PDB file of C-alpha atoms in Angstrom:
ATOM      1  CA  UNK A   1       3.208   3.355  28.278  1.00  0.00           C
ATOM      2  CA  UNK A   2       0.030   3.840  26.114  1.00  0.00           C
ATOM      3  CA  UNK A   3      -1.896   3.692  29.443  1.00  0.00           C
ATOM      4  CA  UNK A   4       0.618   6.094  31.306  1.00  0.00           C
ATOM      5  CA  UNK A   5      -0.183   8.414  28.112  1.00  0.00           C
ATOM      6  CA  UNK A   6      -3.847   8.138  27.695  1.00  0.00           C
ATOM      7  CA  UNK A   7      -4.395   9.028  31.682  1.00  0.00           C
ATOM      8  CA  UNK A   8      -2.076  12.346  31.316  1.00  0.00           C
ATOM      9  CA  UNK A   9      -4.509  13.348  28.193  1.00  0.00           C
ATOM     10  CA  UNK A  10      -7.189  12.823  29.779  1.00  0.00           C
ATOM     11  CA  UNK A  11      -5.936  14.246  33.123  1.00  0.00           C
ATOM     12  CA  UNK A  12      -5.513  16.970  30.552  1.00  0.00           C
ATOM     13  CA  UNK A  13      -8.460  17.153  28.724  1.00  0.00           C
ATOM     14  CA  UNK A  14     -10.340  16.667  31.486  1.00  0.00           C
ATOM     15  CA  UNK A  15     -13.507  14.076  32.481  1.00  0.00           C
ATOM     16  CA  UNK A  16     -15.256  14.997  29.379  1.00  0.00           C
ATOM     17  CA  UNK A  17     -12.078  13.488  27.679  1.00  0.00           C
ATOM     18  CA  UNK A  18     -12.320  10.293  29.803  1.00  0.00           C
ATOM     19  CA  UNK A  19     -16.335  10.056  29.195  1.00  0.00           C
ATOM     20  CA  UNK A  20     -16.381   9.691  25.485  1.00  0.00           C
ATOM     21  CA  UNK A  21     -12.665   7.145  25.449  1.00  0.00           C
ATOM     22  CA  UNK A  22     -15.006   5.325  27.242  1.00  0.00           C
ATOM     23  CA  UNK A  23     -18.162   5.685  24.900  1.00  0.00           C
ATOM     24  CA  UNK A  24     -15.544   5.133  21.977  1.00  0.00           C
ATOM     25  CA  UNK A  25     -13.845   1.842  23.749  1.00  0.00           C
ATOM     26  CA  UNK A  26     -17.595   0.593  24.593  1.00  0.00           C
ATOM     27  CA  UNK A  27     -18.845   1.069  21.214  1.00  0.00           C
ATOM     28  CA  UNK A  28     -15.074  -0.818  19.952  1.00  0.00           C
ATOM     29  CA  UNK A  29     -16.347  -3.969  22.641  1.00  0.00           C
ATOM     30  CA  UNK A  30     -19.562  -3.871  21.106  1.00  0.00           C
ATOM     31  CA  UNK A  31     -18.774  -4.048  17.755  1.00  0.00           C
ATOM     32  CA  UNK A  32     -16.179  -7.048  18.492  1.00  0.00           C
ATOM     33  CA  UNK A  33     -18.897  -8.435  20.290  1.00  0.00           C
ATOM     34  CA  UNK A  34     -20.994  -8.745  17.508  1.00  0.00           C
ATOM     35  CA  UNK A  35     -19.372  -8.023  14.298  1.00  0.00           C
ATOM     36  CA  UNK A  36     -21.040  -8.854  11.308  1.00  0.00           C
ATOM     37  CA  UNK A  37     -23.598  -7.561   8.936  1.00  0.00           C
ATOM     38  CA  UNK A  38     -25.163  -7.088   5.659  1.00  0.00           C
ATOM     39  CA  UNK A  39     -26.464  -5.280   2.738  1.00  0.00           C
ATOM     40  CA  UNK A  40     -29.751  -5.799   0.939  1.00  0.00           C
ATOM     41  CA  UNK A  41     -30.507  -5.723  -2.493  1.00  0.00           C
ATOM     42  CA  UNK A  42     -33.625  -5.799  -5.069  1.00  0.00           C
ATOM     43  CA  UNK A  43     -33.303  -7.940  -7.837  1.00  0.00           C
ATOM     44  CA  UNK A  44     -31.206  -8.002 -11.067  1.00  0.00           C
ATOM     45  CA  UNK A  45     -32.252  -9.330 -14.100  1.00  0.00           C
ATOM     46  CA  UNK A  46     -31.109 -12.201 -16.612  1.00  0.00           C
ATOM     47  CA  UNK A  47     -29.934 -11.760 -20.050  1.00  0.00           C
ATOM     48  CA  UNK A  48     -32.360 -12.576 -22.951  1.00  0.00           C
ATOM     49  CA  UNK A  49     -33.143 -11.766 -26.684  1.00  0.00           C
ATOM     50  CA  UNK A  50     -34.305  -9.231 -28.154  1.00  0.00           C
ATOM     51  CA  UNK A  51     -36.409  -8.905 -31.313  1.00  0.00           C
ATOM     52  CA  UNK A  52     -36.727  -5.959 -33.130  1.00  0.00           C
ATOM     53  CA  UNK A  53     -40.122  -5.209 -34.644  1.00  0.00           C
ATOM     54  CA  UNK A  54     -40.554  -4.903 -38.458  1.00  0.00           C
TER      55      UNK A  54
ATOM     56  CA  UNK B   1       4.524 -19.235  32.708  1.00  0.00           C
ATOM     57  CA  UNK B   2       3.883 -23.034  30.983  1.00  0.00           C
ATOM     58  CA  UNK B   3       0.108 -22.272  32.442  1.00  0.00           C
ATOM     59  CA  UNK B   4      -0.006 -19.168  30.428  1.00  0.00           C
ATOM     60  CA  UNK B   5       1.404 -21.057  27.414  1.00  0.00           C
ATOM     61  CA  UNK B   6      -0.565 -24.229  27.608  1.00  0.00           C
ATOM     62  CA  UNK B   7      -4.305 -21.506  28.606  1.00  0.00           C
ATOM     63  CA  UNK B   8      -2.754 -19.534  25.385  1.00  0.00           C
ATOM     64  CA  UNK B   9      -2.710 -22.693  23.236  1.00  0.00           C
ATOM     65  CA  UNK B  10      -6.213 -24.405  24.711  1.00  0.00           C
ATOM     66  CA  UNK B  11      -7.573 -20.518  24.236  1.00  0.00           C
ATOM     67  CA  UNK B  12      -5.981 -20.592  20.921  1.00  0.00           C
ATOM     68  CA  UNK B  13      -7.314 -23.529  19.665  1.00  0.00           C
ATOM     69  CA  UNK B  14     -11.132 -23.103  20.952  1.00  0.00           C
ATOM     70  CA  UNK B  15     -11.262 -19.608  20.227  1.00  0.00           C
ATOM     71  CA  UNK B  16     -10.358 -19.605  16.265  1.00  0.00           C
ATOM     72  CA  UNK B  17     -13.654 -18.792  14.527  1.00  0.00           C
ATOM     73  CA  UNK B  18     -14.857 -16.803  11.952  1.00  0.00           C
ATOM     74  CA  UNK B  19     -17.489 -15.282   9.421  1.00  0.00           C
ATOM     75  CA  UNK B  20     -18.154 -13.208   6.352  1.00  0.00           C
ATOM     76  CA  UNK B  21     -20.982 -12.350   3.930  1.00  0.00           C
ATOM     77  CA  UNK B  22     -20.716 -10.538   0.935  1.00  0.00           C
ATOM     78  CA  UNK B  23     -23.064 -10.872  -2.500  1.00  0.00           C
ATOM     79  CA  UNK B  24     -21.098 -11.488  -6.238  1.00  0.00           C
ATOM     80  CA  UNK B  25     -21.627 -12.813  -9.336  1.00  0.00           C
ATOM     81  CA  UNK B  26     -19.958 -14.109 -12.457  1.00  0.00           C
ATOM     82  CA  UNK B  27     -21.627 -14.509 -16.244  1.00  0.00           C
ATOM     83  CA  UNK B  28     -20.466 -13.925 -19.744  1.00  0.00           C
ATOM     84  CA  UNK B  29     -22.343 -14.773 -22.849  1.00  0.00           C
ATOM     85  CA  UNK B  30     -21.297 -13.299 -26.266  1.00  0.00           C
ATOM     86  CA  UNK B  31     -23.679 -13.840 -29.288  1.00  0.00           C
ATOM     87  CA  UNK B  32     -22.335 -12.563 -32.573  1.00  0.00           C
ATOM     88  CA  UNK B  33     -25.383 -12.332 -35.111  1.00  0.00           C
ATOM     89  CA  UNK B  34     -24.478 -10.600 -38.006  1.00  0.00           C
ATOM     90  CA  UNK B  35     -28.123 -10.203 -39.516  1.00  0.00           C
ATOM     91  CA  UNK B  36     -30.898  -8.185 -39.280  1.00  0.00           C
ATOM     92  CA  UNK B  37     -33.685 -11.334 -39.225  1.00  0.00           C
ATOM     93  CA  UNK B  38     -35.633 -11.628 -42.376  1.00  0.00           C
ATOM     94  CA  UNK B  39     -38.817 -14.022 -42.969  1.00  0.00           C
ATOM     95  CA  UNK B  40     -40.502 -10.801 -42.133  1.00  0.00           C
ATOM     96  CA  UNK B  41     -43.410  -9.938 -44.960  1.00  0.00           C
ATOM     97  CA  UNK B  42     -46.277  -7.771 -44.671  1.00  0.00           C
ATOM     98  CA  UNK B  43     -49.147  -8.872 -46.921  1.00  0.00           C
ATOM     99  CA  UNK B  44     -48.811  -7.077 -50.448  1.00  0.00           C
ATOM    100  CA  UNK B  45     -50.608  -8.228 -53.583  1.00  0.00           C
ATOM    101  CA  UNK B  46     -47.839  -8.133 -56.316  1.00  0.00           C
ATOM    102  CA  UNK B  47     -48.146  -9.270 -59.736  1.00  0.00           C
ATOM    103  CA  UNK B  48     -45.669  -9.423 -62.655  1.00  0.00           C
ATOM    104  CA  UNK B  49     -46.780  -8.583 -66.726  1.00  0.00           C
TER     105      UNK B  49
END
């Protein structure tokens, strides 16, 4: 039924409709296709002491 | 249909995979001085009558 829908909106909206489903369902494939990714950081730092001056 | 089922289960059981990657940490330290430090002296010539 979601099929029979998504032709009449696009029959609706027209090709341009249909172009970017497509463009939206390709970029969907590719990210299941590869999904996976990370973040990079600079370093933190470590606790230590510290000594006040006289 | 038991083709389907048994494809499902062999597709099942090959197919089952995955990853993540994320970056945490976990410290605690608590140091309780209740002092200012001493042993600190400038050099003073002090005498006493």
């Amino acid at each position: 039924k979601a099929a029979e829908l998504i032709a009449n909106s696009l029959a609706t909206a027209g090709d341009g409709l249909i172009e970017l489903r497509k463009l939206e369902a390709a970029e969907d494939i590719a990210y299941q296709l590869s999904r996976s990714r990370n973040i990079t950081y600079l370093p933190a730092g470590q606790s230590v002491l510290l000594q006040l001056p006289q | 249909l038991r083709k389907i089922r048994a494809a499902q289960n062999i597709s099942k059981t090959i197919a089952t995979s995955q990853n993540r990657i994320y970056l945490t940490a976990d410290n605690l330290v608590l140091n309780l001085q209740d002092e200012s430090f001493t042993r600190g002296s400038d050099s003073l010539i002090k005498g006493k009558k």
